Structures are given as C-alpha cells and as structure tokens.
Amino acid sequence: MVTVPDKNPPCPCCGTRVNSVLNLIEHLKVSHGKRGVCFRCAKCGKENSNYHSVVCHFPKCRGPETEKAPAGEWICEVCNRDFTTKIGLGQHKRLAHPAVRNQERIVASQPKETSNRGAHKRCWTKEEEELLIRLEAQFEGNKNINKLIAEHITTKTAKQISDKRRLLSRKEEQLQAYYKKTLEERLSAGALNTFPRAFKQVMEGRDIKLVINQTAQDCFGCLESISQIRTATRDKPFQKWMKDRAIKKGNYLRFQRLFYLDRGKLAKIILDDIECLSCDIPLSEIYSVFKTRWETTGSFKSLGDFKTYGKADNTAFRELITAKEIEKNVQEMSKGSAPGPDGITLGDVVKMDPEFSRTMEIFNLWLTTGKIPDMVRGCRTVLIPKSSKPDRLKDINNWRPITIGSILLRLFSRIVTARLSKACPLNPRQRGFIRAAGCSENLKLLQTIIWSAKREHRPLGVVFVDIAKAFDTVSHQHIIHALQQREVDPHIVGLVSNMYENISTYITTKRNTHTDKIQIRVGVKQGDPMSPLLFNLAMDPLLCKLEESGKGYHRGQSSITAMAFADDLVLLSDSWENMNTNISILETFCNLTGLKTQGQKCHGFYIKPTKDSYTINDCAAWTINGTPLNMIDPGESEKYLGLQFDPWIGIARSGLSTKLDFWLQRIDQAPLKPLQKTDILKTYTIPRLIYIADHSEVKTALLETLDQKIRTAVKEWLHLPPCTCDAILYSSTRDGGLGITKLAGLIPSVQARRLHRIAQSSDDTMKCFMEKEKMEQLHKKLWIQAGGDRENIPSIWEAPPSSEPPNNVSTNSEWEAPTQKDKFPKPCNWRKNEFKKWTKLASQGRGIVNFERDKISNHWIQYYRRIPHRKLLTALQLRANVYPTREFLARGRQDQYIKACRHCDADIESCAHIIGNCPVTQDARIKRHNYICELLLEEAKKKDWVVFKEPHIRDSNKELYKPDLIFVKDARALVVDVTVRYEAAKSSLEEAAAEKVRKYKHLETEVRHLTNAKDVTFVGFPLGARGKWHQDNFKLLTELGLSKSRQVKMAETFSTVALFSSVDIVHMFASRARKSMVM
DNA sequence: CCTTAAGAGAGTCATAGTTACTCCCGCCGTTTACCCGCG
DNA sequence: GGCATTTGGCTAT
RNA sequence: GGUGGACGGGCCACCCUUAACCCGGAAAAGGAACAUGUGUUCGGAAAAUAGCC
DNA sequence: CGCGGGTAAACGGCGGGAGTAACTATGACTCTCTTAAGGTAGCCAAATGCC
Ligand SMILES: Cc1cn([C@H]2C[C@H](O)[C@@H](COP(=O)(O)OP(=O)(O)OP(=O)(O)O)O2)c(=O)[nH]c1=O
Ligand SMILES: [Mg+2]
Ligand SMILES: [Zn+2]
Ligand SMILES: [Zn+2]
Ligand SMILES: [Zn+2]
Ligand SMILES: [Zn+2]
C-alpha cells in the first residue's frame, strides 16, 4: 500500500527505500512477488489499483473529502444514498435497483376504492344492501309501490328509498424419367465415359443396389489405398531441484511445441483452461446411454393442421452434377476437416482426381439412382468435453456427440443440399442456417421490438422457447413427411430416406477404445451438410402456423409472431393470453411431432405499460406443458444467440472488461515468449470479443477501456515503454506493425456495416418493426466515429455496393457459379489511418514511411521463429525509436537530462548514432558491412560470376577507391558498393545509392583494365539499418541472374541481416556501457 | 564503416447533451349520493 | 531440385 | 570469500554433502503413465450449416 | 313511487411542463520515463507442389 505520490517510497515490506514508485512496484514484483499493490492518494487517501491513475489524480485532488454536503431528504431503502429530489431517488431506483423499481411500479399500478375524503355513510348496509335488491325485485308489476318498502326500511325515507332501487338498478415431368432421358442422351455421346458399363443396367434396373456398391468400392479402394501415403508422414535423482527444473522444462516443451504445431488448441488450453482430457466414463455406460437415446424411433404421429411455406421447386433437381459444381462445393467445404470412419479426407479426393471427373460420375450415378453405397452410410462419433470439472468429468452430459461422416458422403450431401435448399424456400422467419446474417437480424429485431414496446407503451410478451435435442429428436418420419408435404419430387424424397437408412456409428472415447454400432434411428445426422436444412424444413410448419394463427407483437399492419434461429425459437405477443395462444400452438406441435419442451428450460417476460413506464412480469408465469416458465425478472438476463437479454435494459452490456482482463491474465501466466503472447492475443482473444462487442452495440467508452487494457498488456509483454506509439501495435504486420486490433476503430466500423447489412436484407417483415430513423442516425454516428467521410455517408436504406460479378454471359450455371458475397462500405481503413498517424509523428516516426507496404522489409515481424526474442524486442524498439538511448530518455523532459553520447562525446545519442556514427561500434559496423558483402559475393558466385573483392583501383590523382564488390561474367563488370544506411526519410537509400554511383563513376577505363570487360555498370546497394530493403536493389539481383523467388528470399535475408546486425550493434554499445560503469 | 531535432500515451476532471424514465398538475370527462319533476 | 505459391481466426445453432 | 540452485538479476542452502523460491528479453522433460534399470505413451482427438472479421 | 333528467365531489385517463441519474461525448489538462545477459551464430519460416 504505497502513498502515491512519493519521492523515495519505502516498501510496504522489509523496508528498503526505492527511488521511484514504478521502481518500487518492480522491487515488489521481483524481490517479494506481489502483483496487487494498491496506491492511495496522499491528499484524500483515494485508493486505486492503478499507479499513474492516482498520480494524475493528485494534482487535481481537491483536498481530503471534508464536511460532506447536506444530505438530501430522500433515502434509498437498499443502499442508503441521499438525493436532492424525489425524481432523483426514483431514477436511482430505476437505474441501480431494477428489481426494486419494478415492484414499486407494480404497486403503483394497482388501483383501489379508498375514497380518502368525503365518505358519506349510507344508513343502508349489508342487511339492507341485499334486502333492497330483493324487495325491488319482489313487488314488480306494481308501479307506484314503496308503500311496503318504506315499511321495510322505515329507517330511510320515501324519495331517497326510490333513489336507492335506482342506485342499485344503475349497477409433371417425372424427374426419374428426366434423369433417365438426360443420361441416355449424354451417354449416346462420348461425354461421360468413366463408368459406361455400370450405367446401362441402371436405366432398366436389374441389380442397381450392387451397382452402387460395386462402383463405390471399385473407385474407393483407390482413394483408400492413398490414405496410407498420409499415414506414412504422420508416423511421428542427484538432487531434487533437477525434478523441478524437469517439470518446468516439460511445461515449456509442451506449450512451445503446441504453439508451432497448432497454435489453435493452445489458445484454448490457455484460455478457458479446457484440457485434453479423454472421457473416462465406462464404454458400457456411454453405449447404453447413446443406444437408448438414438436407437429409439421417434413418435411422429402426423403434422396435423400445420402446413409448409409454399410449394417445392423441382427444377433445381433436373440439371445434373457437373465437375464445376463439385469444385465449388469442395472450395466451400472446411479445409482441415477430420476424416470419417475410413480415413479419406478432402485431400485424398482432390489428389485422386484434381479435375473432378470420377467423383462427378459417381455422384451422378447415386443421384440418378436414389441410393448411396452401403460403405458410406457410416460415421464415427466422438465425445468431446464441455468443461474441465472432475465432478462433471464423471457426468454424462459434459460431452458432445460430434458425428463424423464419410467425406465423400458429406460432399454429395452438400451438393444435394444446394438443390433441396433452393427447391424448398423456408419461412422468412427462420433466420438460422439460411444465407443471411441470422444472428444479427434476430438480435436487432428483439432489441428493437423491446425498445419500441417500452417507448410506445404497448404490452409485449416474450418467451424464449427451448426445444430439447432438436436435432437428436426430430424423427426421420417427420422429415420425410415434411419433404412430401411440400410436394418435393418423390425421387429426392426417396434419396433422403435412403441417406437415412441403416446408419450406424461407434462413439470413440480414447485412442482405439471404440464402442460398437448404434443404429441411428432417430434424429438428423449431425455432421451431415443436409441436416440443418432438413431440420429447418421439419420446423417450418411451426413457424407457418405461428405466423398465420398466432397473435404476435404488432408495429403497423404486420406481426412478428415467432422469431427463429435453427432450434432456437422466441415467441412474441401483445398480451398475456395471446402469448398463451402461441404457447398452445407450440405445445400442439411438440405433442404431434415428438419434440419435447419443458417450461423449466424455457424463460420469458411480459412488459406491460403504465402511465409513466412499464412493468415486468406483473402477472402469473406462463405454463408450457404444465410446468411454469422461468420468468426473467429485472436485473436478470437470459442468453439468446450468445447475448444476455435483460428485460429491464434490453441487451445486458457486461462481461467484456472482466473477460478481457481474465484472458490477459491467463496469457501472461503461460510459458510463452513475449511475441508469442502477442500472437495468441491478437489471433485468438480479441476475435472472441468482437461478436459481443458488436451485436451488443457497445459505445466508445467500454471499447476504449478494452483497447487500453490490451495496449497495456501488450506493451508490458513486449517490454515497450508506455510512451511507445499506438501505431506499432495497431499497424498491419505488412506495414511494420504488430497487427493487434484497435477495437475503438474496428468495432464502430463493424457495427456501422452490420446496421447496413440489417437494413439491406431480404426479410420484408423484419424491415417494418425496425426504427428506420434511429438506425439511420446510429449508422451516421458510427460511420463518423469509425473515421469515415462526414459528408459521403452511404444511405443504408437505398442499396449495397459490391456487385462485381462475372456479369458477361458466364457459362457457369447457378449451381456452379461461386456464391456471391455482399461487401457493404467500410467507414475507412483504420489500419491505414493508424499508419498515417505513425508517419506524422516526428521522432518515433523517423523514416517509418519506408515500411509502408513492404513484405520483404517486414518479413521478420511475421516469421520470427529462429530469432532470440531479446533481439526481436530490440528490433521493435528500434522501429519505433523507443530504445532506451539517452536521446530517447531525454524526450520531452529535454533540458532535464543530457543527450550526449555515453561512449563518445557526440551531441545526440540517437538510435541512428549508435548504429551508424559512434566510433565505439565501428568494428561491429565493419563486420556487418563485410558480412553483407560476403552474402552478395556468395550469391553472385552461385551464378558463376567472377568477383574482385575490395579491389585496389587508382585514378590520376592516386586516389585509391575500393568498390566493395565487382561481379564479372561474360564481358560485363557490375561494380557494386554496399552501404547499410539508417533510413531517416523516404529518399534516404536512393540518396546513398546515388552517392555511391557518383563517387565511383570516375573509374571506367580503369575498371575496364582490371576486369577485362566493356560493360562497366555501377550500382549502389543501399540497405536499411532497421531492415529496409531498397526496391531498386532487385535490378542488381536481376542482373546477377537470380530467379524471382530466390530474389525475394535473398531480399528478406538481407533485410533480416541488416536489422539484426543493427540490433547487435546496439546491444554491444549498451554492454560496453554496462562493463565500463562498474569500473 | 557512417549521420546530422523533435513525445507520445495514460489517466482523471469538467461541461454539455442523451436516454429513459419520474413526478406532478390540470382538465376532462366519469362514477356516486341526493334533488327535482312526478305520473 | 530450383522455382512458385501459400499460409488464418471467432460467433450462432 | 567460493560453489550449487539449467542460464542472467535476486534470494537462498552448503562449505566437497543441496531443502525451498521470485522476476526475466532465459527456459524443447533427471516431470508423469504402460511394459524390466531401460524402450513406448503425454494426441495435431473437433463434424456440419450460415454469419462475421 | 317509479321513472327519467340534472348534480358537488373525490378520482381514473391523458396531454403537458419541468426534472434528474447514470451514461456518453468532447475538451483541457496533468502525469510517466535511468533499465539493464550475452550469445553461439548460420536465416531455417515451413509446407506443398511442379516442371
Ligand atoms: C451448439 C451446436 C448445435 N448444433 C445443432 C445440433 C444440436 O442438436 C442443436 C441444438 O441442440 P440443443 O438444443 O443445444 O440440445 P439440448 O440442449 O436440447 O440437449 P439436452 O437434452 O442436454 O438438453 O443444434 C450444431 O450443429 N453445432 C453446434 O455447435
Ligand atoms: Mg435446445
Ligand atoms: Zn522486496
Ligand atoms: Zn486525492
Ligand atoms: Zn439505492
Ligand atoms: Zn557516439
């Protein structure tokens, strides 16, 4: 507990006095091992865990908190905070105690009949309150009565009694045949030839099943025989302190081997602490569980009244599978996909047939037949954990059944998908698994609907329905019936039913510890490309009936009755009973189709308007199938599509700061090196925050806090001074930076063009519940905040740009044309803005423009494997002119300290002096220079050039010039002079080369005498002291005869050599100072 | 052999505008306990 | 066997 | 005063005998499991549909 | 005596003015820096194809 600001702060420790609070933190970290020192301001004792924060506070500290101002007369009942006015207390309760203000609103809403003032007692009472209705109904037909009533109630009078029994009175083409004709016609020609004998018995089916299997094996034992090619290359005390050193080296080994083997899964071992455990549940337990789960045919009684969205479009299936279609789908398939239960990966298929012809034949043979071979209807299931909790490592549901099918079945399934997906247009409400940003269009739709309901004072009921095991419960009969009801061609229906025939899998738990076959009789084949589409098609009836017969939230003349994303469903309503209607429809579907939903796993809420505001859950919880829902009260949240929705505030903006700090701690505690931690962060941590930080509509306050945490952590990992420019971290690795992501400049751009994407969408219903002007101005705001043109702001409600297709009559069909993506405008290139900011700095940007877009001068920043990190960090410091030279140390402080060279007596000890001018390092300089010459020498010799290393030439004035190199081959003299010059401007290396060429152009008839040649070329070979490769040097490298790949390799080698020889020069300079100070 | 000015970023603090309400007030028509005409 | 090219992440379900 | 704690800075143990540690720009197992003191293992275990950067 | 119509008198609804807590955005400031491995070297990224 330091007492910032202090001049010679004693440690809260043994007692040693350190010279600075920062040095005190260093002493605590190293000598003691405490990383949580808290700093209290000297004046007011304000405590902050961050040092300089308190340091900056101190000057503006307005003395110790004294004589607390008068306490308002409104005290909160939760935190005892005083407020000046009643409105203040109400707003505090709303903004800090939502569960309290909710109940306050509910209590205020309820009416009563108190009648506080003017309670005129009626001498009438119960005894007569009922007797008067009885007697007024007694003597009826007699008009002009009361002669008996007054006797009944003599206590009252005549006219008033008459007043009282008034008061109380007041209250087609046969796609099979089409395929046959198409084949026949194509086979009469020589177009298709691979399997001509196996196609004729298919036309008039004789042994079609065996034809499928025989063709399969006859062409698949080949691709199997080449899997072994891949398997061949994949074959790969004295003292007790030795034990601890072995453990530490083992942890190192592990992490550094994973880092270069697969940096992925190392990101996940570090972050989320999810280890490589293999499930130890007995194979009998897993066997029985998954047998009873999957080998249990569902109960799909029927689809009832539920219909589907439109009719089928069988034209998609008519035209055949062409090689370019397979190429498109293969390029659209995940590259590093694991193999099925035979080992055949995508690479096997590609190598066995680069220009897909055999596959393009077998796929057509399957499709024309409606059957698939009995060797691909198999898959290997794996149980991969969900969390590393031993008590939950002995839990069955801590594992997932990821099912891997034969890849040649996954590819055919994708090909069949494209066509089935086109032929069956899903309901526009199903935003999952469709070609669109479903998650964004659902999160925005919810957020909006809620905000608009609150603003317009309209009831809104939301239920986050939860189907249990939607993919593992949807019966195959259900899918077949759904396909039939859309009148999809019976041939494709039969093909789908056959793709769901006699499937079995084994759930491998450990290496070679497999279960045996479990016939998958229920559920969609997870891992099969068609399964998402089939699930959407079997779930469409629910959405159709909900949108046609349910009662949903209305904004105008339209009604979103049910949003959906895959199995996720959100029911909406405009009343507590309309939501009961939607829930009843959902129950009907779930009881008629076999899907199971329980209100225990479902949540919801009900926003009911009041005079001032709304109330949440001011009613009984809805019941789904009998068990009441888990109504989400204010202050609680529910995860919808990865974001926490709180009915009190819409989207719960939380977790990003805590998650980022936890991840930074996890990375810092890893046995990784300074530039490996930066890679793990910029490639596997910041991306994880994008989704939440984008779809949650985070502002530039949290974005700046997160970016500040990232910057501090990175600059501490890399041992860069805090004053180092942001550009080096945020500039692209192609421009000399580290490539770290600037969230404050990225997330606004992502949000702006996400809003653009939502506005420019196909969901017509979705773009009616959307607040047009609010998102228009929000898009303008984010565009300006992202650094865009404040005048040329695109109109999100007009059209996108992109386009740029193969517009001119492309022979590619619609199934072969590569899928076109949409490219909405970006506000700006924030990375280029960061680099421009770098270039504008005058001291840390010295000559940085030479690294504008150079991949051969920044090759080391990306590929730094075999370089001591102590060298890499110094290279980074040199590139930003933040190396602790006395010139840099006396920055801003200026006169405060001396900038003179510590070794020589030069005016400024700039980073350029140490590398280029100081006599002390002259030896090293010479070595480096000669070394570079030698490299060039060797390169020239590899092309059989004669070399005159440092020749002794003399002119008339006896002025001996010594051109570093002279290459000669076939009557030519390439005089070359190497020079490693610090780059302090865009035209620095050019100037050096010009100087060399001008100072050696005197010797023409002298070089002719020495070299025995007539073509006396003169070239300067400038190199950057910080690793800048002059582009014109390629000319020389071309004259030597180097290839265009060895040219780039040698350019990278030269840049690396120059940079890391300058680093060594700087290190020698500092080490000489170190070795001389002790004297 | 070579070069030859530089602060930059991190952090509070103050001021002004926004969002999502809070609060009350007046009016405005509406219920409720006798009044009047009353056949 | 020199040359030419290429080379990732995250989110929802 | 010197050695050892892989290496540097500490800080410890011993006086050739080594128990415990901290930080690092250093750290590729004298660590665990299966077989008889020696070899093997420590998995690159991860699918699909869309989206995003 | 019943039946119509009027009725102050608190009070349910709805516009309207004023009002504030907690953010959200912009700007003006003010604060920090002195530490501390040397090193064989041998540029290999590293993989994959291709001709
Ligand atoms: C998360 C996830 C889901 N899906 C699909 C398959 C899943 O069956 C479906 C969602 O299933 P869930 O609804 O998450 O399964 P469940 O929670 O109902 O199971 P439980 O009985 O334990 O309650 O979405 C994927 O294809 N990939 C994924 O990564
Ligand atoms: Mg579910
Ligand atoms: Zn200490
Ligand atoms: Zn203070
Ligand atoms: Zn409070
Ligand atoms: Zn000098």
Numbering used by the authors: 1 to 171, 250 to 314, 327 to 1169
Question: What is the paper's account of this structure, in its own sentences?
Answer:
We therefore assembled TPRT complexes with PlaMe and TaGu proteins with either Gf-full or Gf-98 RNA. Within Gf-full or Gf-98, only the RNA 3′-terminal 65 nt before the base-paired RNA-primer duplex is visible in our cryo-EM density maps. In addition to the provided primer-template duplex, an added ddTTP was also resolved. A major difference between the PlaMe and TaGu proteins, in comparison to each other, is the disposition of the Spacer, the region that connects the N-terminal DNA binding domains to the NTE motifs. In contrast, our R2p structure and the results from our functional assays recommend against CTI disruption in an avian A-clade R2p used for transgene insertion.
R2p inserts a cDNA for the mRNA transcribed from the R2 element by nicking one of the two DNA strands of the target site to create a primer for cDNA synthesis directly into the genome. The shared R2p core domains include the RT fingers and palm motifs (colored as RT domain) followed by the Thumb, a Linker, the C-terminal zinc-knuckle (ZnK), and the restriction-like endonuclease domain (RLE).
